[PDB]
Amino acid sequence: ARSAYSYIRDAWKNPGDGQLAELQWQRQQEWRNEGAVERIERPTRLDKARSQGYKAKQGVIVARVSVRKGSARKRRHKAGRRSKRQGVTRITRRKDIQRVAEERASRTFPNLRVLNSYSVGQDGRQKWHEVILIDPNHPAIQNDDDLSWICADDQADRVFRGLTGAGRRNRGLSGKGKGSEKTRPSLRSNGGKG
């Protein structure tokens, strides 16, 4: 039969219809009043969290984050930039809101590494994302056959280097064949034409 988890997954397919609609109207009232990064004991989406790698273990942290909405908070030109390089409100950035969210969250927790993240909704002025974090130094994770990879020296600050699942997706590394000549092995190696 179906898993109890599959009933949260099926609910989040439409986060504006029914029981979840009335839930998110309520929650966001407290979330708007909550900080930038708030550590929360239990995730909002169990299926998604577990799917991404979350366990109910010692040293597996989850934290909600809220980033401003829209495009870029881009100013104007002080020095002589042409007509083409004069867009203030019409241009956006190259890192999606989920990546900023993951970074803000990894800096709030300078010892924990980012596992993965997901969206927990949005309103007119902000976007919320919940980020799963892991403690690399906790022996509860050092001897875990499903999570001990994150304890390697080369995995240090993995979000900032774009080695996150959310990172590789923004870097244009999803496709294995066509239209991924300029993106693999890295953008920098390909001169930044990604």
Partner 1 sequence: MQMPRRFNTYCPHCNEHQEHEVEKVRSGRQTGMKWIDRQRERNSGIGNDGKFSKVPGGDKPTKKTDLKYRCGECGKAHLREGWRAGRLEFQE
Partner RNA sequence: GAAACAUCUCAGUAUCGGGAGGAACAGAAAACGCAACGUGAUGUCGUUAGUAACCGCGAGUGAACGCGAUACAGCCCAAAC
Partner RNA sequence: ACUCGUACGGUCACUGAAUCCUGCCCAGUGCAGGUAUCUGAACACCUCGUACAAGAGGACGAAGGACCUGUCAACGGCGGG
Partner RNA sequence: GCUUUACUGCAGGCUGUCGCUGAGGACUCUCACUCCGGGAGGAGGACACCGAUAGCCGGGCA
The yes or no reply on residue 58 touching Mg ion (CB under 5 A) is no
Q: What dihedral do alpha carbons 68, 70, 71, 75 form, nearest 10°? A: -60
Which x/- pattern, by CB under 7 A, does the window 17-56 give for RNA?
A: --------x--xx--x--------------x--xx-x-x-
Report how far residue 62's alpha carbon sits from residue 121's, in angstroms, rounded to the nearest whole number. Answer: 16
Place of tokens 């979840």: 20
| Distance between CA atoms of residues 172 and 127, nearest Å | 22
φ, ψ at 31 (rounded to 5°): -70, -35
Residues 21, 56, 91, 152: which binds partner 1 (CB under 8 A)? 91
Residues 180, 6: Cα–Cα separation, whole Å: 34
Q: Which residues, at least 6 apart from 166, have a Cβ–Cβ distance to it below 8 Å?
A: 96, 98, 99, 102, 116, 117
Q: Contact between 114 and Cl ion (CB under 5 A)?
A: yes
Residue 132 near residue 165, CB atoms below 8 Å: no
- Give the span between the Cα atoms of 93 and 71, in whole angstroms: 7
**Nearest distance in Å: CB 151, partner 1:** 46
Stretch of residues binding K ion (CB under 5 A), selected from 23-31, 76-84, 97-105, 137-145: 76-84
End-to-end CA distance of the chain: 44
Applying CB under 8 A, among 2, 42, 82, 178 the residue interacting with partner 1 is 82
The one among 29, 86, 148, 189 contacting Mg ion by CB under 5 A? 189
Nearer to partner 1 by Cβ, of 6 and 92: the residue is 92
β-sheet bridge partners, residue 132: 62, 116
Number of residues that bind partner 1 (CB under 8 A): 8
Site residues (CB under 7 A) for RNA?
1-6, 16, 25, 28-29, 32, 47, 50-51, 53, 55, 69-71, 76-77, 79-84, 86-90, 123-125, 145-146, 153-154, 156-157, 160-163, 168, 171, 173-178, 181-182, 184-186, 189, 191-193
Site residues (CB under 5 A) for K ion?
82
Site residues (CB under 5 A) for Na ion?
106, 110
Site residues (CB under 5 A) for Cl ion?
106, 113-114, 158-159
